[PDB]
Amino acid sequence: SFGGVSVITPGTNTSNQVAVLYQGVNCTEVPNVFQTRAGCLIGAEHVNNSYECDIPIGAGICASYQQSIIAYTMSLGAENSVAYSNNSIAIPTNFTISVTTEILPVSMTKTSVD
Amino acid sequence: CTMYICGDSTECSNLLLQYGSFCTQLNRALTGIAVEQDKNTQEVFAQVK
Amino acid sequence: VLGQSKRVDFCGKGYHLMSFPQSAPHGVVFLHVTYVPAHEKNFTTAPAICHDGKAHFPREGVFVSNGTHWFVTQRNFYEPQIITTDNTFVSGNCDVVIGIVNNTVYDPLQPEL
Amino acid sequence: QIYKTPPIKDFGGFNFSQILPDPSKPSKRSPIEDLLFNKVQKFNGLTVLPPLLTDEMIAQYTSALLAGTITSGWTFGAGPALQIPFPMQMAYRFNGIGVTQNVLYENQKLIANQFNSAIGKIQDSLSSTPSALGKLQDVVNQNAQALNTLVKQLSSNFGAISSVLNDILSRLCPPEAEVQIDRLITGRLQSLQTYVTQQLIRAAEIRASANLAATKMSECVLGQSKRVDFCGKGYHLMSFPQSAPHGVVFLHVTYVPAHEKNFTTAPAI
Numbered sequence: 247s248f249g250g251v252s253v254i255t256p257g258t259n260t261s262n263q264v265a266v267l268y269q270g271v272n273c274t275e276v277p278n279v280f281q282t283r284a285g286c287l288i289g290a291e292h293v294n295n296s297y298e299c300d301i302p303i304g305a306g307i308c309a310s311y312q313q314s315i316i317a318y319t320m321s322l323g324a325e326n327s328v329a330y331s332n333n334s335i336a337i338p339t340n341f342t343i344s345v346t347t348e349i350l351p352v353s354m355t356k357t358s359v360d
Numbered sequence: 361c362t363m364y365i366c367g368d369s370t371e372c373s374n375l376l377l378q379y380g381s382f383c384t385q386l387n388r389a390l391t392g393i394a395v396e397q398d399k400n401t402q403e404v405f406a407q408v409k
Numbered sequence: 410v411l412g413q414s415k416r417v418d419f420c421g422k423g424y425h426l427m428s429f430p431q432s433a434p435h436g437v438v439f440l441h442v443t444y445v446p447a448h449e450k451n452f453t454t455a456p457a458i459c460h461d462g463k464a465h466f467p468r469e470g471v472f473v474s475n476g477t478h479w480f481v482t483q484r485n486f487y488e489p490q491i492i493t494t495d496n497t498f499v500s501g502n503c504d505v506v507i508g509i510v511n512n513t514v515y516d517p518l519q520p521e522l
Numbered sequence: 523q524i525y526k527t528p529p530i531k532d533f534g535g536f537n538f539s540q541i542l543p544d545p546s547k548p549s550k551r552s553p554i555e556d557l558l559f560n561k562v563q564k565f566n567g568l569t570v571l572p573p574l575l576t577d578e579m580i581a582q583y584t585s586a587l588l589a590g591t592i593t594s595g596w597t598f599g600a601g602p603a604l605q606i607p608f609p610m611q612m613a614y615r616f617n618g619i620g621v622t623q624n625v626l627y628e629n630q631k632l633i634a635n636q637f638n639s640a641i642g643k644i645q646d647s648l649s650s651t652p653s654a655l656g657k658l659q660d661v662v663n664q665n666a667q668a669l670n671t672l673v674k675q676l677s678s679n680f681g682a683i684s685s686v687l688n689d690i691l692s693r694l695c696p697p698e699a700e701v702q703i704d705r706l707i708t709g710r711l712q713s714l715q716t717y718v719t720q721q722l723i724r725a726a727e728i729r730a731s732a733n734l735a736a737t738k739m740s741e742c743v744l745g746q747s748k749r750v751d752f753c754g755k756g757y758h759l760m761s762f763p764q765s766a767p768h769g770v771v772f773l774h775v776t777y778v779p780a781h782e783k784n785f786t787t788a789p790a791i
């Protein structure tokens with residue numbers, strides 16, 4: 247048995263705690279141990295809550311620093327059931343003016359080699 | 361590929377085999393391009409029933 | 410920047426009004442100004458109004474009711490107006506359209522003559 | 523937000539049962555999506571990593587987009603989702619193509635029936651057409667071809683006495699092993715560089731396709747397009763996304779003029 251080892255970290259500006267993902271293997275073969283379809287994740291606490299994805303693990307699992315590192319199934323967003331009927335319409339009585347920023351690359355450094 | 365590299369030499373061709381499928385890969389890549397060129401023309405001009 | 414786009418989410422989220430370019434190192438920044446609907450309310454609606462045996466449709470708006478009275482409003486902003494022959498048009502009788510409701514359609518010339 | 527459809531599917535005669543999630547299936551895919559999914563190394567250091575989003579998650583996004591489109595038209599794409607009767611939404615989309623709204627209401631039953639039949643035809647067309655999803659299969663086949671080629675290159679001698687490194691080490695001694703090995707390293711390194719270069723070029727093509735798909739999602743699904751032949755042939759009314767393996771399928775609903783007649787005309791009276 248062999249595979250890749252990935253280290254999950256919050257950043258040294260925050261913490262020196264890490265979690266390790268053993269990619270594509272069983273936790274029983276590795277020798278807070280959580281088996282994912284991406285491999286065995288060690289050092290992360292699995293929770294039954296769901297949050298926006300911070301550090302992607304794979305197969306729907308993300309990790310974040312909450313102190314300790316946690317692993318969770320990522321949320322896709324809040325639910326909203328629209329009040330549909332065959333004679334009901336919703337009409338805005340007001341508005342806002344929004345300004346948003348979009349950033350695009352245009353060019354790169356012009357290098358040359360002898 | 362074989363002709364470009366070896367011409368009509370059998371001695372060269374026999375050595376070239378030791379490199380595996382490199383020639384096949386190159387032939388495939390150029391073929392894919394050639395096919396695309398006809399697709400490109402059709403996408404632009406053949407828009408009328 | 411050089412026009413107003415009707416392409417969805419091309420020039421920011423919401424209904425595009427305008428945009429402004431700003432230069433950046435090896436790139437460009439666009440500031441997109443959009444219109445976003447804010448405070449919606451529930452209203453009762455209908456596809457058509459039946460009056461004098463004729464079916465009436467909105468010229469440029471939607472028929473709405475506040476529970477007691479029928480009005481016609483523009484779609485993206487609530488601004489209720491009295492239903493008249495000037496802001497509706499007639500097509501056919503009241504037998505075909507499903508959900509047609511009975512209401513008065515005012516003719517502005519009526520009281521004048 | 524993840525939008526959900528109403529418990530009661532009353533849309534004025536319009537039937538979306540083939541595109542909406544089927545609760546009897548454990549994957550919660552639509553009838554069409556389920557069909558699409560049915561239709562479409564390790565020991566040498568080559569591995570495959572899982573996607574961040576699962577097929578279930580992708581299906582959930584698709585369901586949210588369909589639920590929004592059906593219950594709130596194109597409003598959910600530009601702000602708050604505002605409910606409107608489906609028949610009235612279709613009336614708005616008729617105006618968008620230069621056809622008066624009374625045409626929709628007077629022909630509502632016919633239009634709903636034409637729509638319902640057209641959707642049914644899609645399900646049958648895909649079921650009976652093996653090549654329908656060739657574009658997605660081609661991506662799968664190309665990637666498989668590249669990996670199989672990469673592995674087979676491990677069988678090449680590249681001028682060495684043997685393709686097998688263990689044979690060289692067990693037979694030849696250290697000064698003369700470093701000659702045979704270097705030949706294998708050179709060939710194997712070249713083979714790997716070739717693979718990576720090809721993957722970068724293919725990746726670019728997929729990215730362009732994904733950018734186009736994202737544009738169509740915005741302009742065909744989250745609104746009504748006036749761009750000719752961008753959202754199907756004919757005058758665009760609306761579109762519905764369906765998930766597929768490594769791809770997306772768009773069902774474009776368009777208005778097509780049918781039975782024309784000759785008339786005499788004049789520029790002015």
Ligand SMILES: *[C@@H]1O[C@H](CO)[C@@H](O)[C@H](O)[C@H]1NC(C)=O
Pocket residue numbers: 259
């Ligand atoms: C690093 O942490 C400091 C606070 O200790 C914070 O002010 C700073 O912005 C952080 N740097 C980054 C890149 O987040």
Ligand SMILES: *[C@@H]1O[C@H](CO)[C@@H](O)[C@H](O)[C@H]1NC(C)=O
Pocket residue numbers: 272274
């Ligand atoms: C390895 O993990 C799989 C699930 O991914 C499980 O079915 C199998 O029993 C595990 N093997 C061992 C020895 O635990």
Ligand SMILES: *[C@@H]1O[C@H](CO)[C@@H](O)[C@H](O)[C@H]1NC(C)=O
Pocket residue numbers: 292293294
């Ligand atoms: C999560 O839920 C499962 C049951 O689905 C339960 O067995 C497990 O202990 C729970 N874990 C946590 C951290 O709540």
Ligand SMILES: *[C@@H]1O[C@H](CO)[C@@H](O)[C@H](O)[C@H]1NC(C)=O
Pocket residue numbers: 339340341342447
């Ligand atoms: C619209 O919203 C703004 C705040 O964004 C508020 O100040 C204004 O009074 C509102 N207009 C109306 C008519 O309610």
Ligand SMILES: *[C@@H]1O[C@H](CO)[C@@H](O)[C@H](O)[C@H]1NC(C)=O
Pocket residue numbers: 329336449450451
């Ligand atoms: C409209 O009515 C529904 C109930 O049918 C309610 O849940 C919803 O919040 C109302 N929406 C607004 C904007 O008042």
Ligand SMILES: *[C@@H]1O[C@H](CO)[C@@H](O)[C@H](O)[C@H]1NC(C)=O
Pocket residue numbers: 475476477478
């Ligand atoms: C509807 O609008 C009319 C005219 O302004 C008003 O007199 C009536 O009270 C309103 N009905 C309700 C339920 O608010």
Ligand SMILES: *[C@@H]1O[C@H](CO)[C@@H](O)[C@H](O)[C@H]1NC(C)=O
Pocket residue numbers: 332333507508
């Ligand atoms: C709307 O639905 C109700 C049932 O909830 C039905 O009685 C009514 O006739 C329907 N009206 C239209 C226009 O579909």
Ligand SMILES: *[C@@H]1O[C@H](CO)[C@@H](O)[C@H](O)[C@H]1NC(C)=O
Pocket residue numbers: 459462511
């Ligand atoms: C609308 O008015 C007509 C008479 O002009 C009447 O026959 C019809 O039943 C009314 N419709 C409703 C729903 O009351």
Ligand SMILES: *[C@@H]1O[C@H](CO)[C@@H](O)[C@H](O)[C@H]1NC(C)=O
Pocket residue numbers: 531537538539
């Ligand atoms: C929608 O279409 C399906 C397939 O033809 C049919 O089985 C179902 O009964 C229809 N639903 C309604 C409400 O007619």
Ligand SMILES: *[C@@H]1O[C@H](CO)[C@@H](O)[C@H](O)[C@H]1NC(C)=O
Pocket residue numbers: 782783784
């Ligand atoms: C219109 O008239 C021409 C003859 O001038 C005829 O060939 C054509 O088929 C007619 N088209 C239709 C739709 O009747």
